[PDB]
Write a protein that holds these residues in place. Structure first.
Motif, mmCIF file in Angstrom:
data_model
loop_
_atom_site.group_PDB
_atom_site.id
_atom_site.type_symbol
_atom_site.label_atom_id
_atom_site.label_comp_id
_atom_site.label_asym_id
_atom_site.label_seq_id
_atom_site.Cartn_x
_atom_site.Cartn_y
_atom_site.Cartn_z
ATOM 1 N N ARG A 235 26.558 -10.540 -0.226
ATOM 2 C CA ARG A 235 26.445 -9.093 0.158
ATOM 3 C C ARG A 235 27.445 -8.959 1.296
ATOM 4 O O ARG A 235 28.284 -8.108 1.283
ATOM 5 N N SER A 236 27.545 -9.867 2.406
ATOM 6 C CA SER A 236 28.237 -9.718 3.229
ATOM 7 C C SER A 236 29.851 -10.260 2.984
ATOM 8 O O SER A 236 30.063 -11.167 2.311
ATOM 9 N N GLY A 237 30.763 -9.278 3.428
ATOM 10 C CA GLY A 237 32.179 -9.833 3.078
ATOM 11 C C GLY A 237 32.974 -8.703 3.615
ATOM 12 O O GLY A 237 32.816 -7.869 4.309
ATOM 13 N N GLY A 238 34.460 -8.926 3.136
ATOM 14 C CA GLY A 238 35.572 -7.720 3.653
ATOM 15 C C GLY A 238 35.611 -6.748 2.674
ATOM 16 O O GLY A 238 36.667 -5.856 2.684
ATOM 17 N N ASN A 239 34.674 -6.391 1.469
ATOM 18 C CA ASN A 239 34.647 -5.713 0.414
ATOM 19 C C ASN A 239 33.428 -4.957 0.328
ATOM 20 O O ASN A 239 33.261 -4.476 -0.869
ATOM 21 N N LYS A 240 32.746 -4.912 1.310
ATOM 22 C CA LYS A 240 31.452 -4.230 0.998
ATOM 23 C C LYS A 240 30.649 -4.597 -0.033
ATOM 24 O O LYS A 240 30.687 -3.830 -1.139
ATOM 25 N N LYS A 241 30.199 -5.893 -0.058
ATOM 26 C CA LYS A 241 29.396 -6.398 -1.368
ATOM 27 C C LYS A 241 27.789 -5.976 -1.415
ATOM 28 O O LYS A 241 27.190 -6.374 -2.233
ATOM 29 N N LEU B 65 23.214 -23.784 0.673
ATOM 30 C CA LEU B 65 23.368 -22.822 -0.439
ATOM 31 C C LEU B 65 22.690 -21.685 -0.192
ATOM 32 O O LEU B 65 23.295 -20.729 -0.433
ATOM 33 N N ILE B 66 21.777 -21.450 0.860
ATOM 34 C CA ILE B 66 21.026 -20.150 1.232
ATOM 35 C C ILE B 66 22.066 -19.520 1.868
ATOM 36 O O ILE B 66 22.086 -18.052 1.608
ATOM 37 N N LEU B 67 22.993 -20.125 2.749
ATOM 38 C CA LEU B 67 23.886 -19.158 3.477
ATOM 39 C C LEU B 67 24.836 -18.554 2.674
ATOM 40 O O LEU B 67 25.108 -17.425 2.770
ATOM 41 N N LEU B 68 25.441 -19.251 1.335
ATOM 42 C CA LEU B 68 26.306 -18.556 0.493
ATOM 43 C C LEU B 68 25.823 -17.428 0.097
ATOM 44 O O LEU B 68 26.301 -16.411 -0.334
#
Length: 64
Positions: free
Chosen positions: A49-55, A41-44
Motif C-alpha cells: 500500500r505504502s509507496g511513491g506511487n500511491k499503491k 514479512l508483515i512489514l513488506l
C-alpha cells in the motif's frame, strides 16, 4: 478458568513425546527465531500500500 488450551489430548494409547521432550530445552530458542522472521514479512505487506506511487488505492468520503 485454568487450562483453556485444547488439542492437547492425544489418542491415549502411546505418548512417546519424551523423545521430543528433550528438545523442549532448545525448542524455545529455535521457535523464537522463526517467529521473528515471520514478523519481517508483515512489514513488506505494508509496502504494497505504502509507496511513491500511491499503491494504497484508498480514499475516505462522507455520504451526503
Amino acid at each position: 478458568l485454568d487450562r483453556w488450551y485444547l488439542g492437547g489430548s492425544p489418542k491415549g494409547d502411546v505418548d512417546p513425546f519424551y523423545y521430543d521432550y528433550e528438545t523442549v530445552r532448545n525448542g524455545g530458542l529455535i521457535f523464537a527465531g522463526l517467529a521473528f522472521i515471520v514478523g519481517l514479512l508483515i512489514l513488506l505487506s505494508r509496502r504494497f500500500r505504502s509507496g511513491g506511487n500511491k499503491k494504497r488505492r484508498q480514499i475516505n468520503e462522507d455520504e451526503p
